[PDB]
């Protein structure tokens, strides 16, 4: 085990923090806990909508939870029934002026957090893992990516002897700093244990 987090390895060069706000020493932990509590409920709820990233900004007394997603209406609801329902339950935790936006994901098959979750959904549905992994890679490359790599590790197919299966097409240069690489992880929970799913998408250099 030896590979650096390819997002944490690009914070501030190719990627941008999911919680962007200044805060002095006596407050950092207090807001930081909020973002985590905020994200805990949200990733549970907006799961069914295709959640990808949750940007969080703060000024003073307020906080603007921007949410990117594949199916926007599943968050909004009918006219705004669910989107207003969220801010309601949201302001209980926030205890303050918690705005909430929703953002369209252009191609969900170019978002690594999404293809990872879909793979994890397939293997939970008792799908042929190796064939599934090749499908995801094929869906990402057909959608215009310049390279993709998907990894699935654990009791694949339910065998006692754990195994690591992966597939890749095109270019995934994990050492290149200027290379825009999206990364996402999902956690297929099976009757016999956990399988970890990693997805790499190469969107091009800069």
């Amino acid at each position: 085990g030896n590979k650096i987090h390819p997002i944490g390895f690009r914070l501030g060069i190719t990627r941008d923090w999911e919680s962007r706000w200044y805060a002095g020493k006596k407050q950092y932990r207090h807001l930081l806990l909020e973002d985590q509590r905020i994200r805990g409920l949200l990733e549970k709820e907006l799961y069914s909508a295709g959640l990808a990233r949750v940007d969080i900004e703060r000024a003073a007394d307020n906080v603007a939870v921007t949410v990117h997603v594949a199916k926007p209406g599943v968050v909004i609801g009918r006219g705004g029934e669910r989107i207003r329902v969220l801010r309601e339950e949201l302001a209980k935790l926030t205890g303050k002026n918690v705005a909430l936006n929703v953002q369209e994901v252009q191609n969900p098959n170019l978002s690594a957090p999404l293809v990872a979750q879909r793979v994890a959904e397939q293997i939970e549905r008792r799908f042929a893992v190796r064939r599934a992994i090749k499908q995801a890679v094929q869906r990402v490359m057909e959608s215009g990516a310049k390279g993709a790599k998907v990894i699935v590790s654990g009791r694949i197919g339910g065998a006692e002897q754990a195994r690591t299966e992966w597939a890749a097409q095109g270019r995934v240069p994990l050492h290149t700093l200027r290379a825009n690489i999206d990364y996402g992880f999902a956690l297929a929970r099976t009757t016999y244990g956990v399988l970890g799913v990693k997805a790499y998408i190469f969107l091009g250099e800069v």
């Binding site: 501030g12 962007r20 706000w21 200044y22 002095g24 900004e57 703060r58 000024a59 603007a64």
Partner: protein
């Protein structure tokens, strides 16, 4: 007539120090240019592994950058258009006299 700007990302800390020494400059009169104060560097060093392997670490830093600006010739025409200011989210302004 003092405005202090603290923030983590220096791209927003500088672009916001520009949009004051530009705004109050036109609105008259004297603005003493943004002075980059030294950065205060919080440091975090942790073992990469969750168990033993004591001799492998990763270095993290949190950078509280600092800027100071003097709008030297106040004029309450400046101290009005600044009241509604489009400062990015990740910046903190302090204003004293």
């Amino acid at each position: 007539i003092r405005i202090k700007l603290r923030g983590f990302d220096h791209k927003t800390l500088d672009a916001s120090a520009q949009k004051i020494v530009e705004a109050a400059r036109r609105s008259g009169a004297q603005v003493s240019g943004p002075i980059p104060l030294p950065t205060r560097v919080r440091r975090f060093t942790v073992i990469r592994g969750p168990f033993k392997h004591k001799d492998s670490r990763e270095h993290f830093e949190l950078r509280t950058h600092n800027r100071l600006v003097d709008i030297i010739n106040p004029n309450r025409k400046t101290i009005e258009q600044l009241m509604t200011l489009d400062l990015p989210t990740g910046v903190e302004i302090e204003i004293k006299t």
